[PDB]
Design an enzyme around this catalytic site. Structure first.
Site, mmCIF file in Angstrom:
data_model
loop_
_atom_site.group_PDB
_atom_site.id
_atom_site.type_symbol
_atom_site.label_atom_id
_atom_site.label_comp_id
_atom_site.label_asym_id
_atom_site.label_seq_id
_atom_site.Cartn_x
_atom_site.Cartn_y
_atom_site.Cartn_z
ATOM 1 N N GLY E 58 2.704 10.820 -1.935
ATOM 2 C CA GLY E 58 3.673 10.212 -1.053
ATOM 3 C C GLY E 58 3.740 8.714 -1.177
ATOM 4 C CB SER E 82 0.947 11.178 4.174
ATOM 5 O OG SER E 82 -0.304 11.604 3.684
ATOM 6 N NE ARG E 83 4.775 15.550 -1.318
ATOM 7 C CZ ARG E 83 4.902 14.391 -1.948
ATOM 8 N NH1 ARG E 83 3.840 13.634 -2.154
ATOM 9 N NH2 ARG E 83 6.090 13.989 -2.373
ATOM 10 C CB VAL E 84 -3.154 14.734 3.077
ATOM 11 C CG1 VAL E 84 -4.408 14.995 3.869
ATOM 12 C CG2 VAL E 84 -3.372 15.064 1.630
#
Lengths: 119, 103, 59, 132, 146, 116
Positions: E58, E82-84
């Site tokens: 990201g 942010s994919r986390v």
């Protein structure tokens, strides 16, 4: 002016001025519409769109596309015709009657045809 | 026709699309406001023009013309339509006085 | 008393009555709508026959 | 018909519109006039006073800032005026007298101000009847 | 493309993937990578930023236009993801910031309305008050972490 | 801020924000005109064109170009002059009395000179 005559040169300059004014005002017409102009320039745009559809000419070779016989309009009638439309002698004629025509005499005649049809 | 010219004009016309959308919404909000004033004018004007219907006050035989338009622009085919109606009515009485309300 | 002779016209007479009732409003319920009813900002410019002008006066 | 169609109208909100009604009481130039079910067609200019509306229900009392009462010949009375009024809330003597003396002071100024000042003097002294 | 070599993706994909999070079997060591891409004229269509965005997790996408409003650090939250994300945050800040994403995603839809008259209801002026003041909160001077 | 002082840093911030809001409002005004803005918006646009043309300056080298003697302005006058025009102490002065001017003293002098 010293080659084709002063009148011819002045008519050509006025026609390119009107069409350049149209091409400059193109974008505001595309966004908002014709209603948001001034009152000189709205007449300028309307006369420009008259002169564009008046620039058409039924060709003697493209007769099968349009269904109209050919039109060979001489020079002097064209000079006087554009001088007449520039001077404002015809500003109330509907625009579509200028389209696909010979000279200004056929503009009057075709406007009379559409006058007798629409009534 | 560069990439930079096209990207700049695309950014300006995305701004124009967003701004015209906002202007449409704000004008719709003021229209929902001003319907109240239109109804309060009309339901009151009936209570005095109904008299003029029953008391038939038809006039006969130097005129005043008053027009109500905007101070601002950008409403389209209003500013020349009502001017043209003034023109039709005004060629009949070219000596008539005019009081405009609206720039 | 001779406001028709000396002072205001009749619509203006009732308009002064409207500003008087709105001025003697209850200050609790004198809302923003009634103060909107008394917000005079219109300007008038008496043009002449030669398209002349006066200064814009706050009516 | 029996009863009357009342149409009370103000520039911001018309209160009554085609309501059936028994009695209205309203101040005209010729004095305080009550209008009932049928009536002579009559146009009465309305001096700023009090209008009382009696129905099958009780009579609601309004102060009114002037206008026109008009009796449409099918016995439909319309009132076309400016200001509404509650029971008693909208008027207070602290705002009345303290401004009223200033208005009488404006009544000695130049002519256009003094005329409107005298009008407001008359309206506040009419409001004294609402003070009652 | 743009005269870069062929395997330049194989450059950066060999670099950034050296960061990780080891298991409890290995000892729970951890490397965390923050690379920086200097883009050109507000672009993500260039070849290196396309490659790095295809690698990483990201953007903290920063802009000059948000910088000249004084919003410092100029973090474009309408693009920065942010994919986390909400997996690895402090629970204390998680249990209150979960609506903040929603408020700012609302506010960026509407903030063109904030440059006109008072012709709005409270349903939009409420979100505008929240949006102006929450965006004003994200200002901070440099070298002052909290 | 900790090098040029908090006054200078905040003046720079307000000038930078004013010019940014002007640059963003230049999308609206090019079609809708001035008539659609708020009062604080029209104030901001006028102040922004003020602060914009206040950065014009004649040059001692470029005296052959403008015919104008070179105005060289020190810093301490400049920071306070921007402080004044940000606070709006000279909003009454029209735009054209700021162009190609040195400090605020010559601003007021040209503002009086162009009255005639």
């Amino acid at each position: 002016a010293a080659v084709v005559g002063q009148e011819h040169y002045d008519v050509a300059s006025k026609v390119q001025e009107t069409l350049q004014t149209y091409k400059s005002l193109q974008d505001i017409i595309a966004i908002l519409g014709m209603d948001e102009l001034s009152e000189q320039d709205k007449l300028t745009v309307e006369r420009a769109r008259k002169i564009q559809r008046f620039l058409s000419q039924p060709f003697a070779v493209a007769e099968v596309f349009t269904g109209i016989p050919g039109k060979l309009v001489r020079l002097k009638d064209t000079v006087a015709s554009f001088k007449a439309v520039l001077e404002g002698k015809y500003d109330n004629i509907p625009e579509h009657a200028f389209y696909m025509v010979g000279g200004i005499e056929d503009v009057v005649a075709k406007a009379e045809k559409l006058a007798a049809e629409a009534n | 026709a560069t990439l930079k010219e096209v990207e700049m004009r695309l950014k300006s016309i995305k701004n124009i699309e967003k701004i015209t959308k906002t202007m449409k919404i704000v004008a719709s909000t003021r229209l929902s406001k001003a319907e109240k004033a239109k109804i309060s004018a009309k339901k009151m004007d009936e209570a005095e023009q109904l008299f003029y219907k029953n008391a038939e006050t038809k006039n006969l035989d130097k005129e005043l013309i008053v027009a109500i338009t905007s101070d601002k622009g950008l409403c389209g085919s209003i500013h020349s339509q009502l001017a043209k109606a003034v023109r039709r009515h005004l060629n009949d009485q070219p000596n008539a006085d005019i009081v405009t309300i609206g720039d | 008393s001779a406001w028709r002779k000396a002072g205001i016209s009749y619509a203006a007479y009732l308009n002064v009555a409207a500003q008087a009732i709105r001025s003697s409003l209850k200050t609790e319920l004198q809302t923003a709508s009634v103060l909107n009813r008394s917000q005079t900002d219109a300007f008038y410019t008496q043009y002449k026959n030669g398209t002349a002008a006066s200064e814009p006066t706050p009516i | 018909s029996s009863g009357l169609k009342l149409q009370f109208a103000l520039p911001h909100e018309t209160l009554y519109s085609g309501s059936e009604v028994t009695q209205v009481n309203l101040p005209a130039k010729s004095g305080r006039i009550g209008v009932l079910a049928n009536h002579v067609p009559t146009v009465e200019q309305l001096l700023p006073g009090v209008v009382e509306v009696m129905e099958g229900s009780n009579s609601k009392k309004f102060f009114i800032s002037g206008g026109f009462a008009t009796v449409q010949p099918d016995s439909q009375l319309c009132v076309t005026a400016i200001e509404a009024f509650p029971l008693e809330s909208f008027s207070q003597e602290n705002i009345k007298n303290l401004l009223a003396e200033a208005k009488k002071n404006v009544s000695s100024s130049d002519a256009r101000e003094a005329a409107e000042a005298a009008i407001q003097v008359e309206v506040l002294e009419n409001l004294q009847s609402v003070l009652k | 493309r743009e005269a870069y070599p062929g395997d330049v993706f194989y450059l950066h994909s060999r670099l950034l993937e050296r960061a990780a999070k080891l298991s409890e079997k290995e000892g729970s060591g951890s490397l965390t990578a923050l690379p920086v891409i200097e883009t050109q004229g507000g672009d993500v269509s260039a070849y290196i930023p396309t490659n790095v965005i295809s690698i990483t997790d990201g953007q903290i996408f920063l802009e000059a236009e948000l910088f000249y409003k004084g919003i410092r650090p100029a973090i474009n939250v309408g693009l920065s993801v942010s994919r986390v994300g909400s997996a690895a945050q402090v629970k204390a800040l998680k249990q209150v910031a979960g609506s903040l994403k929603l408020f700012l995603a609302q506010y960026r839809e509407v903030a063109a309305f904030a440059q006109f008259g008072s012709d709005l209801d409270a349903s939009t002026k409420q979100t505008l008050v929240r949006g102006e003041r929450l965006t004003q909160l994200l200002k901070q001077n440099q070298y002052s972490p909290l």
